[PDB]
């Protein structure tokens, strides 16, 4: 019935990353005294890494897909989706489905080694949060009105850039 | 005016630029208001309390910053309110040092 499934966690939490970003995937599952190895799966395939956390120094498009893990005392985890994008700018989030009353933490991330200033976060084509530099947009209590298509906008260097849109739904 | 009851602790180096600028502003506003001589050094820790409404939600920053007072590095607690209703620089945006105390 209810099994002790391992849980993949992203560090950082963003499931949408730009190419060249670092991503660490951690397996939340207990070890046994003899077997402290971790089973890591990528697109249903068992990869060589057997460490606690699967580290990606510079993400490529081949690193996208679903990841699952398992430890001695846990069960094969549910899958976690990792999307790798290529662009000057990107709207990041830990997921795209948020339960009502949960926090919505968004981040506007610019391409490797680029400055980002005057960040704006927009919902359904309307400006929602204005910053002078590049701050995350934190919404502590998700509501039904927080659902919509989001993107962030700013100056990458001196170029005014808008990110791709992202749908966010809130379940009641 | 009506803020969520929760107060988020800002992890290390998140919003560092927005926060470091709001710290300098706070010192400059203190020096201007009390004719003081504090020199900013760095932000130690920061917290954020977010406004309730949907559009242009304000933020209340609780900043702990280090400043030089006649060469003596001391800790201060700054409280800064920021509500940006349009992309800066615009005069519809508000920024106010509400409290500035030592520790
Ligand atoms: C994993 O699957 C995703 C989605 O189909 C794909 O984009 C990616 O290239 C795949 N990577 C590998 C190593 O198979
Ligand atoms: C856990 O360890 C036992 C013995 O140490 C082994 O038989 C079993 O296959 C291990 N399970 C996993 C999931 O590695
Ligand atoms: C958002 O979802 C709608 C379906 O309601 C779809 O038509 C649209 O293409 C989606 N947009 C994005 C950016 O995923
Ligand atoms: Cl968070």
Swiss-Prot record, chain A:
Keywords: Cell membrane, Disulfide bond, Glycoprotein, IgG-binding protein, Immunity, Immunoglobulin domain, Membrane, Phosphoprotein, Receptor, Repeat, Secreted, Signal, Transmembrane, Transmembrane helix
Gene Ontology molecular function: IgG binding; IgG receptor activity; immune receptor activity; low-affinity IgG receptor activity
Stretches in topological domain Extracellular: 1-172
From-to range in the entire protein, with total length: 21 to 192 of 254
Location of this chain's protein in the cell: Cell membrane; Secreted
ATP-binding recorded as keyword: no
Induction comment: Up-regulated in a monocyte subset upon exposure to IL10, TGFB and MCSF.
Cellular component per GO, a single term: extracellular space
Associated disease: Immunodeficiency 20: A rare autosomal recessive primary immunodeficiency characterized by functional deficiency of NK cells. Affected individuals typically present with severe herpes viral infections, particularly Epstein Barr virus (EBV), and human papillomavirus (HPV).
Maturation and modification: Glycosylated. Contains high mannose- and complex-type oligosaccharides. Glycosylation at Asn-160 is mandatory for high affinity binding to the Fc and for discrimination between fucosylated and afucosylated IgG glycoforms. Undergoes rapid ectodomain shedding upon NK cell stimulation. The soluble form is produced by a proteolytic cleavage mediated by ADAM17. Repeated stimulation causes receptor shedding, a mechanism that allows for increased NK cell motility and detachment from opsonized target cells while avoiding activation-induced NK cell apoptosis.
Note in the entry: Encoded by one of two nearly identical genes: FCGR3A (shown here) and FCGR3B which are expressed in a tissue-specific manner.
Lineage: superkingdom: Eukaryota
Protein name in UniProt: Low affinity immunoglobulin gamma Fc region receptor III-A
